[PDB]
Amino acid sequence: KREAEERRRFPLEQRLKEHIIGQESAIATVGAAIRRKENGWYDEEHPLVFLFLGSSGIGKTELAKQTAKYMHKDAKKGFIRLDMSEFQERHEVAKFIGSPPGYVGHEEGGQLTKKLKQCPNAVVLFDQVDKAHPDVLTIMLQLFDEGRLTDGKGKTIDCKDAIFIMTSNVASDEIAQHALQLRQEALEMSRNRIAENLGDVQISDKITISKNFKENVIRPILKAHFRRDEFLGRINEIVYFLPFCHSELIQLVNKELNFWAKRAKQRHNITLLWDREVADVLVDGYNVHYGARSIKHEVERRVVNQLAAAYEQDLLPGGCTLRITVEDSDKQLPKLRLEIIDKDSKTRRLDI
Amino acid sequence: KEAEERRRFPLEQRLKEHIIGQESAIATVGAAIRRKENGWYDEEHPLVFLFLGSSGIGKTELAKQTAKYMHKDAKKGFIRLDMSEFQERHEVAKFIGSPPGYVGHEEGGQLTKKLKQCPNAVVLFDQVDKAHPDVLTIMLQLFDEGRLTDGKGKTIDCKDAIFIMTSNVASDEIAQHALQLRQEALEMSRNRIAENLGDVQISDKITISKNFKENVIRPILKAHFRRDEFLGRINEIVYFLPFCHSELIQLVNKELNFWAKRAKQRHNITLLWDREVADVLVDGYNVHYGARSIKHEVERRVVNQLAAAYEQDLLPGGCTLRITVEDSDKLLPKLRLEIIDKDSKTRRL
Amino acid sequence: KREAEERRRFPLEQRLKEHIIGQESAIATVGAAIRRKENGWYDEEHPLVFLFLGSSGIGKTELAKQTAKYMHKDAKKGFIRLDMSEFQERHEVAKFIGSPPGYVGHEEGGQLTKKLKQCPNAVVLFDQVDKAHPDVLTIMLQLFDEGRLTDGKGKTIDCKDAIFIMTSNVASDEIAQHALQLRQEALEMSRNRIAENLGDVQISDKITISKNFKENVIRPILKAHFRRDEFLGRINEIVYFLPFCHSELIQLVNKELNFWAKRAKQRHNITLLWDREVADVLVDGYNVHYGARSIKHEVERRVVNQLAAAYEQDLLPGGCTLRITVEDSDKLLLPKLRLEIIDKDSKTRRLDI
Ligand SMILES: Nc1ncnc2c1ncn2[C@@H]1O[C@H](COP(=O)(O)OP(=O)(O)OP(=O)(O)O)[C@@H](O)[C@H]1O
Ligand SMILES: Nc1ncnc2c1ncn2[C@@H]1O[C@H](COP(=O)(O)OP(=O)(O)OP(=O)(O)O)[C@@H](O)[C@H]1O
Ligand SMILES: Nc1ncnc2c1ncn2[C@@H]1O[C@H](COP(=O)(O)OP(=O)(O)OP(=O)(O)O)[C@@H](O)[C@H]1O
Ligand SMILES: [Mg+2]
Ligand SMILES: [Mg+2]
Ligand SMILES: [Mg+2]
């Protein structure tokens, strides 16, 4: 009975927003799909299958990780990551099932069926399914249609309540092109709205995928790649993803510096402060093609190197406060510098 | 709810902001794209254009600006293939890849991959004159139904694509008949002015007659492309008229505006020019080579000595320049640059 | 019994004459061969092979598409349309039968053989067979002989019940010239019978191609192009297509204007109406060499562009009706047609574009 109050007081959409920012249309559709599971309007005879498409770096595995953290407490037993990049050969179906009878290796058992029987409510993610050979997809079509497995010993494993996600990268640049095209049309009409001063109607930058772009472009490509129409017809949910916008990327820079300041405060009580020009230069030091990995390890390289060289020669006492500021030589146009806030509010420089 | 943009700033304005003197061609392609975007065009067959004109008249840039209008500065929506590579019969393999059992089979076809990644992409076949006629034979399916089949047997879809082919066939004939029609129009306007009923002159564009389109140009089109099938699949055969003097002035003004914009962005130097410099730059116009004949002649009378000025440090930042005609060469021909200083003093460079 | 009843109440000729207009000898000969196939009056060990010869933009590809749509309601599976422009070189035979064992596409198999393996009663349309290399055409020797084909994995396939239709424009100019000459001769004889007061005989314009023109002109150019006097032997019929006359082109103009009226009504509730001068101005600028395709483009720029523009400035509300009217100032009789709104009180209002 308490699960209803925990659901209403703590909706998952806010928490999935607060872990991963951006992809608000994707967050909304996975929130609607998960909400249409537990309130009694669902299919028990079909396992819930999520098919996560999108580009790189922007976040699919972490989003599904937070989904499994939401539905299951433990991230070990209820959270299984099968790497379909490993399975690229015909006999790897044995790793799905087991050895044939009359042959050795049958005594070890089947790994996936043991994972699904030991943890029936677990969340299983398939990473890099594009390189999987077609026959392991066929042994997955057995689960994808029926949800029941038989191993070489003959034992029966039911997998309905388990939650299945496949993360793929087919037509990532294509969905990126449709997102960028609809965003370009939105920008070109929004500049007309600014010119006509039409501020009465609220403007949302939660731009979603168009309805007729996905059937014109993406569906014949997926029919050519997956080779089965029944695979594309049997899917419970397909979630498409979009490249990050401009202000959301500034929020991402703020988010990365936010956990870096949180880690400094938790380890040695250090409070960081940042400027908008630092965020501008970091967005300049970002790569669109592989997403937020660029901004994550760029913030890891830029600011953490300077505080690490400060800690190596003990220029960072605990309990003080730091500011990061673009250097005045590079503020014309990039080198950034650290400044210590004194009790007299004097900006101490560094000589490392 | 983008149709309001189509009400406020159509294709004709965007093309006339980049392409001048081709108002008939702009009107034709704008009407066809307007018919396509309003849901008023059959989606069974793709829209096919064939631009015929003299060189340097703006056919390739009209195709490029058309692609910019559709896909908004996106690299994928503009599939450009130069057909000048496709001079032999086996070059068709470059479209579709090799058959099974052959080298390059797993790579697949190039145009097929580019049209699979974007089916509504604008495909520009540059220089369809320059390809072999048997290479154009593969265009029959792709223009009739947008149905191209791969090396591996997969079939792509091009039902909503826009194909634009540039050519130089009958360029001498088109240019000669256009200048002859402008000449007789000028003569008949002057003759009607002799009784003071000739201020109408003509329309802005020369209406190329259907009799001239069928009895003259079409035999050369049939003779070079060797096939009435390929000409039948072409939805709009769009003719480009050569420039007359009024838009030659505007064209020289556009080039000089670009070279004034090359400064002031990184040197803070302005460039100002009179009308007689525009007259003596229109004077060096070659009919055979088109606007490109102007485009690399303008610097020959404007920028090169200006380049020498940048080698002689005669242009600091903040100068005010003026290109005028030489007094001794007023034959009409060299030009000379001057700097006007803040106390209204002219210094000849 | 039920299929015989269905063929009795409406033959193939009525359905395809609805879908394709003109070409009466072509549809008659094709429907006769199909009727021989359907009623069990044919040698089952030989597949039925057609070569569609005629001008461009006449309807050969459309007629064979309509025939394959008549055979199966599912035209995705039982209609194998292979385009011969991909097959301009000899090694493109590897697209048909697949690669030999030991090469990159061997496990994929032959592309034609797998589609014929899915269904062996399919209509295979070899589009533009003039364009393929003749050594590629040498594989249709064993396709047309006993209806068998060997895959790259050694598994032969049977195609005894399949129907193979090729289309080409070999001798397009000769067929069009001879058909125009025969039309001129028939019109001369008709006006002579009018001048001789002979009009009691119903002489329809079903012009037939003589055997002497087939054997004198079409056969040497066919043997010069296909370069083998054994490929043409296995072709069961040479179906002949003719350029349109005036009334057929008028019916084509009315057909496409009916199509645009149907689209306007079913998408935006717009009723269209036109006069006979509309058909005259949509037939006058006709090119024979582009056939029906030329007529289509004449409907496209003269009328449909004005419809799209008049939609763009928002002059076409739901339920309104338009009349297409020839221009008075071009009564030049490229002209122009005007769109006139008819209101509730049957008044004519010209619309500005
Ligand atoms: N939008 C984001 N917000 C916050 N952190 C992010 C974001 N994107 C990536 N990260 C961080 O970077 C890591 C990258 O993992 P993530 O699952 O987000 O990437 P991905 O795009 O799914 O990866 P891959 O392309 O390899 O499938 C995350 O674990 C997280 O720490
Ligand atoms: N309408 C125009 N008027 C004047 N100059 C133009 C116009 N369009 C383009 N130009 C300029 O002239 C150059 C030549 O144009 P473009 O490359 O389109 O050639 P073209 O007319 O298609 O001829 P060709 O087919 O022989 O290449 C362009 O690079 C541009 O700088
Ligand atoms: N006789 C006709 N009756 C009705 N529609 C026709 C006719 N001929 C052509 N069409 C229309 O024009 C299109 C072109 O026809 P189709 O491709 O069959 O012509 P074709 O003469 O066989 O072609 P090709 O140029 O390859 O020889 C058809 O799909 C149809 O829409
Ligand atoms: Mg990931
Ligand atoms: Mg060019
Ligand atoms: Mg055809």
Tab-separated table of C-alpha atoms in Angstrom, chain B residues 46-49 63-64 66-67 70-71 76-83 95 111 114-116 118-126 139 142-143 156 158 160-166:
chain	number	residue	atom	x	y	z
B	46	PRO	CA	10.475	12.239	-58.138
B	47	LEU	CA	10.862	15.754	-59.486
B	48	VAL	CA	13.529	16.081	-62.188
B	49	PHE	CA	15.085	19.324	-63.453
B	63	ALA	CA	21.069	23.802	-57.400
B	64	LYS	CA	23.202	24.464	-54.301
B	66	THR	CA	17.896	24.977	-53.723
B	67	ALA	CA	19.506	22.316	-51.523
B	70	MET	CA	15.410	22.311	-48.407
B	71	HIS	CA	17.804	20.817	-45.906
B	76	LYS	CA	23.573	14.975	-46.126
B	77	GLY	CA	20.578	16.499	-47.893
B	78	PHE	CA	22.721	17.642	-50.820
B	79	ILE	CA	24.084	14.647	-52.745
B	80	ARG	CA	26.387	16.111	-55.376
B	81	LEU	CA	27.738	13.819	-58.069
B	82	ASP	CA	29.943	15.192	-60.806
B	83	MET	CA	29.061	13.152	-63.857
B	95	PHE	CA	26.571	4.142	-58.579
B	111	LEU	CA	24.771	6.944	-54.558
B	114	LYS	CA	23.701	8.420	-49.880
B	115	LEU	CA	20.062	8.086	-50.966
B	116	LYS	CA	19.384	5.435	-48.318
B	118	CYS	CA	18.413	10.543	-46.911
B	119	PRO	CA	15.608	9.686	-49.367
B	120	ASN	CA	14.320	13.255	-49.743
B	121	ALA	CA	17.823	14.622	-50.369
B	122	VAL	CA	18.420	16.975	-53.282
B	123	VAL	CA	20.644	15.109	-55.746
B	124	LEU	CA	22.653	17.305	-58.109
B	125	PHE	CA	24.060	15.622	-61.196
B	126	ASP	CA	26.628	18.188	-62.267
B	139	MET	CA	18.768	7.192	-64.559
B	142	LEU	CA	15.609	6.573	-60.718
B	143	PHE	CA	13.651	9.271	-62.551
B	156	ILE	CA	16.327	1.946	-52.216
B	158	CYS	CA	13.641	7.892	-53.927
B	160	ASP	CA	10.298	12.219	-52.681
B	161	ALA	CA	13.810	13.111	-53.883
B	162	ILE	CA	14.587	16.089	-56.114
B	163	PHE	CA	17.010	15.471	-58.983
B	164	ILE	CA	18.715	18.450	-60.638
B	165	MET	CA	20.969	17.950	-63.672
B	166	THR	CA	23.156	20.726	-65.056
